[PDB]
Amino acid sequence: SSSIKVLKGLDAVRKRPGMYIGDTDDGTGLHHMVFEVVDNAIDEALAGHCKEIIVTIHADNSVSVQDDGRGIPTGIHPEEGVSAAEVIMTVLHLHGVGVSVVNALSQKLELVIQREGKIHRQIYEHGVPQAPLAVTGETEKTGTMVRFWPSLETFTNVTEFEYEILAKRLRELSFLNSGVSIRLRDKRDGKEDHFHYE
């Protein structure tokens, strides 16, 4: 059972967030949540499909990452009875460990996928999907959007995202991945930036 594995992996991440995300007391793990989601969007860029990424700090202290790539495949996976996107959002395999870590450590996560003319949406709570991915509407755009509300059971002390921390790494990432265009917007004060290196 994939379902059994999935919940074991999630539970493994909650019990040992240090080895997956970093220190949970000093801010580093909290911001590493953003960078992990961002790194997935960059993969879609490196793969040649995404060109703009927008990172938003929301005023309710969640962060969203939007890409204009293909959008995570929505097809019920041939292997596990749920959408391929749910697999990517929930399956652990530190070998092959990725964005499930963020899902596990978020009190809530919102996933919106635009592809093949359709908008698909799923909500997760502590990594657990409220329902299967479902079509909520129609669109002519493509891409993936992950917004996450970090668990305040997991994170102490530094619980609010810092603009400058996110600006510094995003600037570095566009530098290292020349050609990727990344926008950062703060909804708390209206501050924004655009990082591209060519």
Ligand X SMILES: CNc1cccc2cc(C(=O)Nc3cccc(C(=O)O)c3)c(=O)[nH]c12
110 catalytic residue (yes or no): no
Contact at 8 Å (CB) between 177 and 42?
yes
- Reported as half-sphere exposure (CB side, CA atoms, 13 A), residue 104 has a value of 25
Answer yes or no whether residue 44 interacts with ligand X by CB under 6 A.
yes
Task: For ligand X, give the closer residue by CB, 30 or 101.
Answer: 101
- Interface region with ligand X, contact rule CB under 6 A, candidates 38-46, 125-133, 150-158, 172-180: 38-46
- Please choose, from the candidates 86, 115, 79, the residue with its C-alpha nearest in 3D space to the C-alpha of residue 103: 86
Task: For ligand X, give the closer residue by CB, 29 or 69.
Answer: 69
Site string for ligand X, 106-145 (x = CB under 6 A): --------------------------------------x-
- Residue type at position 106: S
Answer yes or no whether residue 40 interacts with ligand X by CB under 6 A.
yes
Answer yes or no whether residue 72 interacts with ligand X by CB under 6 A.
yes
CA-to-CA dists, residue 94 to 9, 40, 97, 111, 164, angstroms: 11, 16, 5, 24, 29
Who's near 117: CB < 8 A, 6+ residues apart? Answer: 138, 139, 140
Residues that bind ligand X (CB under 6 A): 37, 40-41, 44, 65, 67, 69-70, 72-73, 88, 99, 144, 146
